[PDB]
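Ligand-bound model needed. GO7.
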Amino acid sequence: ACVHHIKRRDIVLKWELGEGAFGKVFLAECHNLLPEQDKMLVAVKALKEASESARQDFQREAELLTMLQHQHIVRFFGVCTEGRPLLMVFEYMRHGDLNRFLRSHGPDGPLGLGQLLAVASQVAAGMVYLAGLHFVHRDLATRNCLVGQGLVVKIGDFGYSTDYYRTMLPIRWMPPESILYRKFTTESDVWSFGVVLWEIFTYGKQPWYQLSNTEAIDCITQGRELERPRACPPEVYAIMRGCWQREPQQRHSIKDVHARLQALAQAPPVYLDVLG
Ligand SMILES: CC(C)(O)COc1ccc(C(N)=O)c(O[C@H]2CCN(C(=O)Cc3ccc(OC(F)(F)F)cc3)C[C@H]2F)c1
Ligand SMILES: O=c1[nH]cnc2scc(-c3ccccc3)c12
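Prediction:
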């Protein structure tokens, strides 16, 4: 609602974490933000376009990120509108995006079953929060999740061009009805969560990596399912299949998916990937 305003001089730019057509993302030090933390690290999203439509869309977005407050939703600290670029201040997630983290902690040390379940459960938690507010993410993927201190996994949205097919759609994460009709609901977000589970248990591999964007559309629209990852116990694959029901009305709700994952996270199945 009422967006926090950070003074430009309170932001000290330390390095560039990445960029896009939108502008740049920086690692920065931020003064007078949190109590007892005189200086703290943050990630700063800087917008290239400073036009009236760009300023209005920014305020809309900043107000929305201000409402979204949860343990597994990336923290929004405020804005800086002291000229171009317009700056959005978020918490710094030291391990970067979940996809990169998964791959870099894959068997290619490696994350064990319990760690994978914790990751999965944390993403499910953030989604229960979003589903509660009737908020549709539309782009749930491990590349839009972030990992901070203590393997704390939170959901974000960066806005990985190989993951989208031309409007640029993340088809491999999309259920049949979103590919065909461009309709995004909590039920399609559930489908995406199931693909996010597959990604977790493949250590960030691309769903349908053997196939091209146009071949993957055929797979999904013909009801062809992603195979059970070798590191995935059958109990979790059961959860993925429930997320992938062809009919949106027949997919499990995220609250249920979370409950089953939270249960598995506390008492993990005795499963060794090496045996299958
Ligand atoms: C990809 C790479 C180049 O390899 C690494 O780039 C990095 C590395 C690290 C960081 C970091 N934060 O430490 C980083 O920051 C960005 C991540 C994406 N952003 C959001 O997710 C904001 C947001 C959007 C929607 C939300 O609400 C929702 F979507 F959850 F509903 C909540 C938050 C903005 C910014 F935070 C980029
Ligand atoms: O971020 C970078 N990447 C690769 N080389 C370099 S040299 C300097 C930077 C930098 C330093 C502070 C803010 C922003 C950028 C940098």
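The chain has two domains: 1-92, 93-264.
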